[PDB]
Design a protein around this motif. Structure first.
Motif, PDB file in Angstrom:
ATOM      1  N   UNK E 189       0.816  -1.210   0.000  1.00 41.64           N
ATOM      2  CA  UNK E 189       0.000   0.000   0.000  1.00 41.64           C
ATOM      3  C   UNK E 189       0.853   1.265   0.000  1.00 41.64           C
ATOM      4  N   UNK E 190       2.060   1.205   0.568  1.00 45.15           N
ATOM      5  CA  UNK E 190       2.927   2.368   0.700  1.00 45.15           C
ATOM      6  C   UNK E 190       4.346   1.907   1.014  1.00 45.15           C
ATOM      7  N   UNK E 191       5.307   2.747   0.638  1.00 39.54           N
ATOM      8  CA  UNK E 191       6.678   2.674   1.126  1.00 39.54           C
ATOM      9  C   UNK E 191       6.927   3.869   2.042  1.00 39.54           C
ATOM     10  N   UNK E 192       7.963   3.800   2.870  1.00 41.63           N
ATOM     11  CA  UNK E 192       8.269   4.902   3.769  1.00 41.63           C
ATOM     12  C   UNK E 192       9.772   5.118   3.871  1.00 41.63           C
ATOM     13  N   UNK E 193      10.165   6.384   3.701  1.00 40.81           N
ATOM     14  CA  UNK E 193      11.562   6.877   3.786  1.00 40.81           C
ATOM     15  C   UNK E 193      11.926   6.954   5.262  1.00 40.81           C
ATOM     16  N   UNK E 194      13.067   6.369   5.630  1.00 40.94           N
ATOM     17  CA  UNK E 194      13.533   6.487   7.006  1.00 40.94           C
ATOM     18  C   UNK E 194      14.975   6.978   7.033  1.00 40.94           C
ATOM     19  N   UNK E 195      15.224   7.982   7.875  1.00 45.54           N
ATOM     20  CA  UNK E 195      16.543   8.559   8.119  1.00 45.54           C
ATOM     21  C   UNK E 195      16.764   8.507   9.622  1.00 45.54           C
ATOM     22  N   UNK E 196      17.893   7.947  10.054  1.00 49.82           N
ATOM     23  CA  UNK E 196      18.238   7.951  11.468  1.00 49.82           C
ATOM     24  C   UNK E 196      19.488   8.790  11.689  1.00 49.82           C
ATOM     25  N   UNK E 197      19.485   9.576  12.763  1.00 51.46           N
ATOM     26  CA  UNK E 197      20.716  10.172  13.262  1.00 51.46           C
ATOM     27  C   UNK E 197      20.769   9.918  14.762  1.00 51.46           C
ATOM     28  N   UNK E 198      21.824   9.221  15.196  1.00 53.14           N
ATOM     29  CA  UNK E 198      22.183   9.046  16.613  1.00 53.14           C
ATOM     30  C   UNK E 198      21.113   8.317  17.434  1.00 53.14           C
ATOM     31  N   UNK E 199      20.291   7.508  16.760  1.00 53.67           N
ATOM     32  CA  UNK E 199      19.194   6.814  17.400  1.00 53.67           C
ATOM     33  C   UNK E 199      17.814   7.362  17.095  1.00 53.67           C
ATOM     34  N   UNK E 200      17.713   8.596  16.600  1.00 53.26           N
ATOM     35  CA  UNK E 200      16.426   9.203  16.282  1.00 53.26           C
ATOM     36  C   UNK E 200      16.103   9.006  14.808  1.00 53.26           C
ATOM     37  N   UNK E 201      14.821   8.794  14.515  1.00 54.00           N
ATOM     38  CA  UNK E 201      14.383   8.355  13.198  1.00 54.00           C
ATOM     39  C   UNK E 201      13.351   9.317  12.629  1.00 54.00           C
ATOM     40  N   UNK E 202      13.548   9.719  11.379  1.00 57.31           N
ATOM     41  CA  UNK E 202      12.590  10.532  10.641  1.00 57.31           C
ATOM     42  C   UNK E 202      11.729   9.580   9.824  1.00 57.31           C
TER      43      UNK E 202
END
Ligand SMILES: *[C@@H]1O[C@H](CO)[C@@H](O[C@@H]2O[C@H](CO)[C@@H](O[C@@H]3O[C@H](CO[C@H]4O[C@H](CO[C@H]5O[C@H](CO)[C@@H](O)[C@H](O)[C@@H]5O)[C@@H](O)[C@H](O)[C@@H]4O)[C@@H](O)[C@H](O[C@H]4O[C@H](CO)[C@@H](O)[C@H](O)[C@@H]4O[C@H]4O[C@H](CO)[C@@H](O)[C@H](O)[C@@H]4O[C@H]4O[C@H](CO)[C@@H](O)[C@H](O)[C@@H]4O)[C@@H]3O)[C@H](O)[C@H]2NC(C)=O)[C@H](O)[C@H]1NC(C)=O
Ligand SMILES: *[C@@H]1O[C@H](CO)[C@@H](O[C@@H]2O[C@H](CO)[C@@H](O[C@@H]3O[C@H](CO)[C@@H](O)[C@H](O[C@H]4O[C@H](CO)[C@@H](O)[C@H](O)[C@@H]4O)[C@@H]3O)[C@H](O)[C@H]2NC(C)=O)[C@H](O)[C@H]1NC(C)=O
Ligand SMILES: *[C@@H]1O[C@H](CO)[C@@H](O[C@@H]2O[C@H](CO)[C@@H](O[C@@H]3O[C@H](CO)[C@@H](O)[C@H](O)[C@@H]3O)[C@H](O)[C@H]2NC(C)=O)[C@H](O)[C@H]1NC(C)=O
Ligand SMILES: *[C@@H]1O[C@H](CO)[C@@H](O[C@@H]2O[C@H](CO)[C@@H](O)[C@H](O)[C@H]2NC(C)=O)[C@H](O)[C@H]1NC(C)=O
Ligand SMILES: *[C@@H]1O[C@H](CO)[C@@H](O[C@@H]2O[C@H](CO)[C@@H](O)[C@H](O)[C@H]2NC(C)=O)[C@H](O)[C@H]1NC(C)=O
Ligand SMILES: *[C@@H]1O[C@H](CO)[C@@H](O[C@@H]2O[C@H](CO)[C@@H](O)[C@H](O)[C@H]2NC(C)=O)[C@H](O)[C@H]1NC(C)=O
Ligand SMILES: *[C@@H]1O[C@H](CO)[C@@H](O[C@@H]2O[C@H](CO)[C@@H](O)[C@H](O)[C@H]2NC(C)=O)[C@H](O)[C@H]1NC(C)=O
Ligand SMILES: *[C@@H]1O[C@H](CO)[C@@H](O[C@@H]2O[C@H](CO)[C@@H](O)[C@H](O)[C@H]2NC(C)=O)[C@H](O)[C@H]1NC(C)=O
Ligand SMILES: *[C@@H]1O[C@H](CO)[C@@H](O[C@@H]2O[C@H](CO)[C@@H](O)[C@H](O)[C@H]2NC(C)=O)[C@H](O)[C@H]1NC(C)=O
Ligand SMILES: *[C@@H]1O[C@H](CO)[C@@H](O[C@@H]2O[C@H](CO)[C@@H](O)[C@H](O)[C@H]2NC(C)=O)[C@H](O)[C@H]1NC(C)=O
Ligand SMILES: *[C@@H]1O[C@H](CO)[C@@H](O[C@@H]2O[C@H](CO)[C@@H](O)[C@H](O)[C@H]2NC(C)=O)[C@H](O)[C@H]1NC(C)=O
Ligand SMILES: *[C@@H]1O[C@H](CO)[C@@H](O)[C@H](O)[C@H]1NC(C)=O
Ligand SMILES: *[C@@H]1O[C@H](CO)[C@@H](O)[C@H](O)[C@H]1NC(C)=O
Ligand SMILES: *[C@@H]1O[C@H](CO)[C@@H](O)[C@H](O)[C@H]1NC(C)=O
Ligand SMILES: *[C@@H]1O[C@H](CO)[C@@H](O)[C@H](O)[C@H]1NC(C)=O
Lengths: 230, 104, 227, 292, 211
Positions: E189-202
């Motif tokens: 149904x969807x894909x999702x972009x994930x960016x992590x810095x230092x343990x935190x995730x966008x």
């Protein structure tokens, strides 16, 4: 005062005479001594050799006799020609000029000094690799804007020999224009992705063409970005 | 002869947070070098808790300074109120004191 | 020239022992006696001992028996006789042995004695202290608000010496007083350093005490202002 | 990279303390003091005939004024006439106990730290028309010189036997530079303005007087020898004696100069000396009072 | 080649490493990665035009003291390689650079991320490819992860990145291309972009009908 632009083909085949030509303006080239320096990737820098104004030809005794410099005073075009090229000649080529100095440490006219040089104009660099592969025309697809500022983009898929130049509005758009490294494909190719910040009140108005240049494949591209409802 | 300008530097909280504070009497710009500089804690004479140093005769003014200290424990300063020194010289016809009442 | 180079500055703990050297040059080292004297900060001079080269015969004081010992090193070069090195080992150190040691030679003479001392070495200080190396803190000093008043700081409880303290880094030099190091409070020194300024500028400027305890690489900066 | 070399870097065996064990030692010999046998292999200049006696290090050779005195029953007479060319009657004589202190300096072609004249330049020879006789010239004003060895050196201490060592050159701490001497030019061109003036009273007014430089020989007689600072300089003086004369500020003349340390003075058969190296650079200042 | 590390503002000291003999004439460059070298110090002491005054060689040295470069106060854009080019009198004609030290500064702020979002471009959806592209930047430090889930399920196929690398604004970057196709879009149904810095995730989400 002196402006230096580097030219040179992105891919050449191994065991072939290389040619790097140095575009020179100003015409003050006959007050200087001209040279080339190079950086094989992963190392520091290394000189190549000197051409004078009276044409005194010297070169580095860490390469063999397969190096030749020519200099033209008419077209004002310097030339670098690495003969019998190998993959060991994969590097980035800087064209440079240098003045002369002399550090006197004693009695002049007894010969108690020596000369020292330094470089004053830095060029723009040309990247050349060596492989038996052939040049591949790109497959360029402009990326549409989103609704926020706004995200103008472009894709150059299927390109080698790398790098890729991508500009905008036939080169006239320089505000908010930036590219990132073209991401290495597993097929030996590269895919540039562009990012340009334009306001959305303007991005749906003017004629945003993804402008690309490609000298090694001999192709120029101009394709229009189309709007979309992201 | 000359007269030193008497001070009294109050016990700051900066050293009483460590447990020992400094009540600093401070005389400057006098001659002769000898002086009888006494002090009092809640108007009562103390001893054995002081380290007093003199200086040397200057090359430009040819004068002297003096700095005494009264280092006690943190229970001992907040116990009392009236802090004062005493200054006595050949060149002074009257004893001079200055004060700093604690908390006030 | 008759040179006497003595080395060097030592900090030790009680119970230890120190060896102090004294290099001589410019004369025939095998000919002249070498005295050793000690200069107490509150008792004056005190004669340690006496060494005669060419054989090494020694004599000491009688209050320093069983602790001191000294010898020499003769240059053996047929083409360089004019230098030599003396030594002294002063064992059984206590904190009351802290002073400045000298290595003293007499002069050329016709009608005099042995003890008149002409050529003097620079000396070296032997500190005996059980305190360990510790940095200084810094604590401001000011009045609460015409007449001149003392700004300053307090540089308390360091070891060892010396602290070099400058003001506003460092051009504020006039009106600046320093005291010698306040003696051992459980083995640690302090320095008072006050600067007199007219009392109008107290409410205007921010003043800085720049402690530099170099042997511990400590550096602190307190602002001084009328609190 | 050779521009014009001077020093050579050598290697040889030498006994340790115990005289059955041999070790490799090096030194830095000048190229004048090393000749070729046949990588490559060299040796000293006089292993055929001479026993090179190392001058003791506790020694010092230096000009110190000697006064020649006569014992009882004898006396020395001093002329005081200021026109005394060297022979005949002296109308002003005074007895002296001991002569003034002459400073023994052994030089060739030029007389250093000598005694001056009184009024004018004094030209002085034996049979002036004879060629084989030398012509002594004496100045009334000194002509200064400045000499140096501008490279810095230290000493090794390679031993030979029990109690007897040997000094050699160890390292060039700095930069290689040629030893040289300066003579000022405006003072030298005026000092030749007097020697020409009173040569013409012996030969003729309308003659042309020229100076040439040399015609051959060893280093002891083609050049200017010193003994200054403990070393032995042989300077090339073809730049001073070069001009003509036709009867009508600060720029100094530089003189290049060689150095050698195995000298043979008076050329006795099978004898030679050796000067130990001096630690540090050398500086000298001298006057030139006269020519030959 | 060689690291070096000081705090921002702290005085850097670069000794050369060329045991110079005799008389010398040292030159120091600024080789700032992404650009060409820059002649900083000329003939031991000259700072030409275009070089800021915070850089100075050693004009006051006599014969025997080691030449060292003194940067007074470091700005963010001063991470570069600092070659010591040293000619002598007791050597030949000198063609070897010798290093060098990389002044990598510490105490630099600050990781503040963003993701730029890019469509399935309808000009090549007919050619059976997807132009789902994230373009990521604005870091310190820049060692950053990019990821792509199928609504809960991690996928790694068709993805190609580089290593992280700097921008012009003294912060880092990370970019990525995805070789997805319209067969691989419509399965989920969807894909999702994930960016992590230092343990935190966008987390950012896309779809074929909401890009
Ligand atoms: C017999 O006679 C002979 C001739 O009469 C004598 O031969 C002479 O021998 C000396 C050596 O003993 C030679 O000196 C060297 O010459 C170099 C060439 O000079 C050039 O630049 C000159 C600049 O002029 C200024 O400076 C000089 C002296 O400083 C001064 O006199 C003059 O009035 C003026 O103020 C110019 O005048 C010349 O014509 C040349 O163009 C000279 O540069 C050498 O000095 C160098 O090197 C030494 C050692 O390396 C350093 O200690 C010096 O300080 C100086 O180095 C300076 O510059 C370098 C850059 O090149 C830097 O790397 C250094 O750090 C240093 O920089 C500082 O100092 C500078 C001076 O202010 C500043 O500009 C800087 O910013 C720094 O502050 C060296 O002295 C003579 O050349 C030579 N003459 C001839 C004609 O050949 C012989 O000695 C006599 N023998 C006897 C026995 O008497
Ligand atoms: C012509 O006459 C001049 C005028 O006297 C004469 O110059 C003199 O040369 C001597 C050379 O020995 C100088 O003596 C030296 O001077 C320096 C000056 O700093 C001193 O350092 C020296 O001391 C050392 O002496 C020994 C050398 O190894 C060592 O044993 C000792 O420990 C010292 O290290 C020494 O005194 C003298 O100073 C000058 N005179 C003047 C006025 O400057 C010149 O040599 C004569 N010409 C010739 C060809 O001889
Ligand atoms: C150095 O000075 C002395 C004296 O001042 C010079 O001696 C003089 O030499 C001349 C040579 O012609 C002598 O003249 C000759 O005298 C003889 C008789 O004695 C006569 O027969 C000749 O016709 C001629 O006149 C002169 O007498 C003599 N002086 C004295 C006082 O006897 C000498 O020549 C000088 N040296 C040089 C190199 O010039
Ligand atoms: C060391 O220096 C000497 C001095 O210049 C060199 O000597 C040369 O020797 C050859 C041998 O026959 C002569 O032909 C040349 O004329 C000499 N001079 C020059 C300037 O070449 C010698 O070559 C040097 N050593 C080495 C190993 O090259
Ligand atoms: C003269 O030669 C000797 C050796 O033949 C040189 O001494 C060597 O110097 C190097 C320095 O790079 C050292 O690593 C070696 O250990 C030295 N060898 C010995 C045996 O000590 C010397 O440097 C040369 N001198 C000159 C002026 O070139
Ligand atoms: C010792 O003397 C011999 C003989 O002169 C020198 O060897 C060479 O010998 C040939 C033929 O006898 C002469 O023509 C050469 O002139 C000689 N060479 C030289 C340099 O004189 C030998 O070299 C001499 N050894 C020393 C150390 O002087
Ligand atoms: C010649 O070389 C010596 C070293 O072999 C130099 O002496 C040094 O001088 C420096 C500067 O004063 C001192 O720091 C060293 O301690 C000295 N070394 C020794 C062993 O004494 C000397 O200065 C040089 N001479 C010249 C004219 O440069
Ligand atoms: C020889 O060296 C001396 C120095 O030892 C020179 O004397 C100096 O000359 C300059 C220029 O005239 C003066 O400024 C100095 O004051 C002189 N020094 C002294 C101590 O007086 C002399 O000029 C040199 N001679 C030659 C011919 O070069
Ligand atoms: C000064 O003396 C030198 C040698 O002492 C003479 O130099 C010679 O000059 C001729 C040219 O006429 C050259 O062909 C020779 O090679 C030189 N000799 C040497 C050994 O190199 C010179 O002629 C003399 N005169 C002048 C005015 O310099
Ligand atoms: C003494 O110096 C003169 C020059 O001052 C030397 O003459 C030179 O000789 C070489 C040898 O061929 C020539 O290349 C030069 O051109 C000559 N110089 C001049 C100015 O003519 C002379 O050779 C030196 N003496 C010795 C023995 O070498
Ligand atoms: C070398 O010459 C100088 C110059 O004459 C001598 O130095 C003195 O120079 C002054 C000039 O102001 C004369 O008035 C003196 O008569 C000179 N002599 C003395 C002893 O002061 C220098 O003495 C000469 N060298 C020697 C060894 O005599
Ligand atoms: C030792 O006594 C003698 C007797 O003449 C006297 O001259 C000398 O000064 C005395 N020495 C000392 C060191 O007092
Ligand atoms: C010296 O001076 C004379 C007279 O001024 C002049 O003729 C001559 O050329 C000068 N130089 C030499 C080397 O004689
Ligand atoms: C030469 O000149 C001198 C100068 O006074 C003069 O006395 C003499 O007569 C002259 N000789 C000739 C032959 O002209
Ligand atoms: C000799 O004299 C000539 C002519 O004046 C001159 O050119 C030459 O330089 C002189 N020689 C030397 C070594 O100075």
């Amino acid at each position: 005062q002196v402006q230096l632009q580097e030219s040179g083909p992105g891919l050449v085949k191994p065991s072939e005479t290389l040619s790097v030509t140095c575009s020179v303006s100003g015409d003050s080239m006959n007050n200087y001594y001209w040279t080339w320096i190079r950086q094989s990737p992963g190392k520091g820098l290394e000189w190549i050799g000197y051409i004078s104004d009276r044409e005194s030809a010297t070169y580095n005794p860490s390469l063999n006799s397969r190096v030749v410099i020519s200099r033209d005073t008419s077209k004002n075009q310097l030339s670098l020609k690495l003969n019998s090229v190998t993959p060991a000649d994969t590097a980035v080529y800087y064209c440079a000029t240098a003045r002369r100095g002399q550090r006197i440490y004693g009695v002049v006219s007894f010969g108690e000094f020596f000369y020292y040089y330094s470089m004053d104009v830095w060029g723009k660099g040309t990247t050349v690799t060596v492989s038996s592969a052939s040049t591949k025309g790109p497959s360029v697809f402009p990326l549409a804007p989103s609704s926020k500022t706004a995200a103008l983009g472009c894709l150059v898929k299927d390109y080698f020999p790398e790098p890729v130049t991508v500009s905008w509005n036939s080169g006239a758009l320089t505000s908010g224009v930036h590219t990132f490294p073209a991401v290495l494909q597993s097929s030996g190719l590269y895919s540039l992705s562009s990012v340009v910040t334009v306001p959305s009140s303007s991005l749906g108005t003017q004629t945003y063409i993804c402008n690309v240049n490609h000298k090694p494949s001999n192709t120029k591209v101009d394709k229009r970005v189309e709007p979309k409802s992201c | 002869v000359a007269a030193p300008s008497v001070f009294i530097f109050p016990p700051s909280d900066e050293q009483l947070k460590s447990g020992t504070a400094s009540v600093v009497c401070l005389l400057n710009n006098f001659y002769p070098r000898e002086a009888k500089v006494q002090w009092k804690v809640d108007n009562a004479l103390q001893s054995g808790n002081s380290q007093e140093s003199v200086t040397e005769q200057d090359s430009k003014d040819s004068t002297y300074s003096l700095s005494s200290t009264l280092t006690l424990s943190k229970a001992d300063y907040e116990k009392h109120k009236v802090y004062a020194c005493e200054v006595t010289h050949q060149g002074l016809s009257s004893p001079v004191t200055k004060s700093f009442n604690r908390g006030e | 020239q008759v040179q006497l180079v003595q080395s060097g500055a030592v900090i030790k703990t009680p119970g230890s022992s120190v060896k102090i050297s004294c290099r001589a040059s410019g004369y025939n080292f095998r000919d002249y006696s070498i005295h050793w004297v000690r200069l107490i900060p509150d008792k004056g001079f005190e004669w340690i001992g006496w060494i005669k080269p060419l054989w090494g015969a020694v004599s000491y004081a009688r209050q320093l028996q069983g602790r001191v010992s000294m010898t020499r090193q003769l240059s053996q070069d047929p083409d360089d006789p004019d230098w030599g090195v003396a030594y002294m080992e002063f064992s059984g150190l206590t904190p009351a042995d802290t002073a400045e040691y000298f290595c003293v030679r007499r002069g050329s003479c016709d009608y005099c004695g042995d003890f008149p001392w002409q050529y003097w070495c620079q000396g070296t200080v032997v500190v005996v202290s059980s305190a360990s190396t510790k940095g200084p803190s810094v604590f401001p000093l000011a009045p609460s608000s015409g007449g001149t008043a003392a700004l300053g700081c307090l540089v308390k409880d360091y070891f060892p010496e010396p602290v070099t303290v400058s003001w506003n880094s460092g051009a504020l030099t006039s009106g600046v007083h320093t005291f010698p190091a306040v003696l051992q409070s459980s083995g640690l020194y302090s320095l008072s350093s006050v600067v007199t300024v007219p009392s109008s500028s107290l409410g205007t400027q921010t003043y800085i005490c720049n402690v530099n305890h170099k042997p511990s690489n400590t550096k602190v900066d307190k602002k001084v202002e009328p609190k | 990279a050779i521009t014009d070399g001077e020093l050579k870097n050598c290697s040889f065996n030498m006994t340790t303390e115990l005289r059955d064990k041999k070790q490799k030692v090096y030194s830095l010999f000048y190229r004048l003091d090393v000749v070729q046998i046949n990588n490559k292999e060299y040796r000293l200049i006089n292993c055929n005939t001479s026993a090179i006696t190392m001058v003791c290090p506790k020694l010092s050779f230096e000009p110190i004024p000697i006064h020649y005195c006569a014992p009882a029953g004898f006396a020395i007479l001093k002329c005081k006439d200021k026109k005394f060319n060297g022979t005949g009657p002296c109308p002003s004589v005074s007895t002296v106990q001991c002569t003034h202190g002459i400073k023994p300096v052994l030089s060739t072609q030029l007389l250093l730290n000598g005694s001056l004249a009184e009024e004018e330049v004094m030209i002085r020879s034996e049979n002036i028309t004879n060629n084989a006789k030398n012509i002594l010239v004496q100045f009334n004003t000194p002509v200064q010189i400045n000499c140096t060895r501008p490279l810095n050196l230290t000493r090794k201490s390679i031993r030979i036997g029990p109690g007897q060592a040997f000094y050699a050159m160890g390292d060039i701490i700095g930069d290689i530079r040629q030893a040289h001497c300066n003579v000022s030019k405006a003072t030298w061109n005026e000092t030749l303005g007097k020697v020409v003036k009173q040569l013409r009273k012996h030969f003729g007014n309308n003659t042309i007087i020229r100076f040439a430089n040399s015609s051959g020989g060893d280093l002891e007689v083609t050049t200017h020898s010193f003994n200054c600072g403990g070393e032995f300089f042989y300077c090339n003086t073809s730049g001073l004696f070069n001009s003509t004369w036709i009867s009508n500020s600060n720029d100094s003349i530089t003189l290049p100069c060689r150095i050698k340390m195995i000298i043979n003075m008076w050329q006795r058969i099978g004898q030679a000396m050796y000067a130990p190296p001096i630690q540090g650079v050398i500086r000298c200042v001298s006057n030139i009072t006269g020519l030959i | 080649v060689r690291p070096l590390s000081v705090a921002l503002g702290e005085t850097a000291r670069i000794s050369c490493g060329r045991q110079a003999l005799g008389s010398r004439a040292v030159q120091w460059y600024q080789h700032r990665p992404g650009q060409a070298p820059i002649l900083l110090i000329y003939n031991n002491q000259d700072r030409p035009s275009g070089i800021p005054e915070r850089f100075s060689g050693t004009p006051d040295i006599n014969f025997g003291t080691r030449a060292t470069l003194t940067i007074s106060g470091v700005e963010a854009g001063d991470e570069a390689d600092y070659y010591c080019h040293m000619w002598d009198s007791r050597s030949g004609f000198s063609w070897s650079f010798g290093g060098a030290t990389r002044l990598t500064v510490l105490g630099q702020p600050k990781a503040a991320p963003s993701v730029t979002l890019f469509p399935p471009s309808s000009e090549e959806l007919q050619a059976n490819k997807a132009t789902l592209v994230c373009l990521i930047s604005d870091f310190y430090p820049g060692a950053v992860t990019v990821a792509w889930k199928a609504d809960s399920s991690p996928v790694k196929a068709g993805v190609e990145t580089t290593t992280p690398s700097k921008q012009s604004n003294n912060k880092y970057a990370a970019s990525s291309y995805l070789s997805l196709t319209p067969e691989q879009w419509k399965s989920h149904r969807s894909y999702s972009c994930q960016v992590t810095h230092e343990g935190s995730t966008v987390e950012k989400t896309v779809a074929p009908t909401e890009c």
